[PDB]
Design a protein around this ligand. Sequence first.
Ligand SMILES: [Ca+2]
Ligand SMILES: [Ca+2]
Ligand SMILES: [Ca+2]
Ligand SMILES: [Ca+2]
Lengths: 250, 244
Amino acid sequence: LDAACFWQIWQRFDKEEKGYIRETELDAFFDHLLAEENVQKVKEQLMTSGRILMKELASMFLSEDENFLLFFRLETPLDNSVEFMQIWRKYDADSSGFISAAELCNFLRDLFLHHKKNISEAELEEYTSTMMKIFDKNKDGRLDLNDLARILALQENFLLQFKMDASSTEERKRDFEKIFAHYDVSKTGALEGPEVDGFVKDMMELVQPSISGVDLDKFREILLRHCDVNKDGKIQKSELALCLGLKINP
Amino acid sequence: SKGEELFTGVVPILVELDGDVNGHKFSVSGEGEGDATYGKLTLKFICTTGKLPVPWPTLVTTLVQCFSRYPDHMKRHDFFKSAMPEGYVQERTIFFKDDGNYKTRAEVKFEGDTLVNRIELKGIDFKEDGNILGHKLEYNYNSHNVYIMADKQKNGIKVNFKTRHNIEDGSVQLADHYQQNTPIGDGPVLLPDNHYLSTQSALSKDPNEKRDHMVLLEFVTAAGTMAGIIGNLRHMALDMGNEI
Ligand SMILES: [Ca+2]
Ligand SMILES: [Ca+2]
Ligand SMILES: [Ca+2]
Ligand SMILES: [Ca+2]
């Protein structure tokens, strides 16, 4: 049992990636696993004494590195969608709109290093291969933007909290300023690079399913063509204010 | 506001008008019901004094904007309902291009469980062979916007709009409206930001009615105010998504 084989069994029960199975599904999960698994028996006993989280069962079957790969951000999530795109941009080094195995391997190498974990180059390729098996949904040999979001346990769309009422001039301004401060991580007065990316992603996702990395590139240029008044490729506060109908231009 | 609560289901309506246009006297009654939750109005009007000396379309606006549908994000701008139940006074001058003008005063309020609109209308300076006294307007009606602004001094609103009445030779008769609405009570009311009511009307007949009459159905919605910022975000997203 490698992590990929385990994941594949688990995904037959956790079909909606809830990250748990039901307790009823537990016995039949063990049956799939038993097709030395004798640790299985030990395992049942372990917490047989309403759901069953993946970390619980996985703690008992996968290696310590494999548990790290599967849960290293369910513990410590991202800052926000800007940090997410920063990672995406860094590792899609050819800007393909897709993360390849050679690219994913670099992500894992850097991740292990910075977590202060030593692993051999042969380990790194097994992990690369294992991670690809788990997260490459359409089995096309590449990871899409949402796949990396799932590896990173990307949290909820920040923009969903804002409400249709709250139309007051004061409310719109409070909400503009909160939105702008969120994406302007570097505090420059403008959205640049992944700050743009993160805002595009969150905005587009208000009205359509999770977008691909190729489409993020397309929507990013469409947004710039819409509101980039001085055409410098960054979105100054005043440009976004005007395009969101803010009454007094900052 | 507490007025909103009074418009939650179907509400009966009565209308009474007494008029005099260039000396011709008439009286009109109407009854029906309003359904603000769906912006809908259903009414039937009758001339109780015989033949209507003007065309029915010239009276539509005079013959209850409290039955407009204000979307949830615009409830703070609905003056009409906020003045209920005590009601409001509605005053207008209506100028028909190249012809006469009407001047009206009405009181709109709850009388028991019924919303009642009582009106007095006076028209002067009409040409006898014009489009109005000559009955040359078509029995139909166009869609318009009604622009509403607060009038903070009088603790009401001032309203302006233009209606277009099709004439039988294919041209158009304009009617220019100036409108003031003032609360009857001294309780406080909602003074809105600038906006409009988008209005659509359809005129028809009651198949069993022998008297001179008009059946009117109306659908009205408030609009034109800015929503929460999430609204501009969603709207921009949809637009960016096109063609791509
Ligand atoms: Ca790539
Ligand atoms: Ca794929
Ligand atoms: Ca910035
Ligand atoms: Ca710019």
